[PDB]
């Protein structure tokens, strides 16, 4: 409530407070099951363009 109101003294009543309580500690990455590498050797190292 103090951080929402930007003051160290709050008055009597109800106050709607923005979220400060939760911070993510882990990250997950989900990609498709792809194994082979892209043929950039064919695209970039071709004999004739």
């Amino acid at each position: 409530t103090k951080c929402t109101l930007k003051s160290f003294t709050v008055e009597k009543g109800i106050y709607q407070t923005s979220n400060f309580r939760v911070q993510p500690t882990e990250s997950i990455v989900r990609f498709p099951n792809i194994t082979n590498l892209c043929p950039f050797g064919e695209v970039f190292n071709a004999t004739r363009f």
Partner: protein
């Protein structure tokens, strides 16, 4: 697609050419997980109803 939130299992059904879901069009709610073809809907981590 990167973000911060919480996921739940969703009963939505996706067409085969659809990957993301946006009922409000400024927040991606439903997504199709790439490895397992289940559809997971994403709600924000922020419980602001306090």
């Amino acid at each position: 697609l990167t973000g911060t939130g919480v996921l739940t299992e969703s009963n939505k059904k996706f067409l085969p050419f659809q990957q993301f879901g946006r009922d409000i069009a400024d927040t991606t709610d439903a997504v199709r997980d790439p490895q397992t073809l289940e559809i997971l809907d994403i709600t924000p981590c922020s419980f602001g109803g306090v």
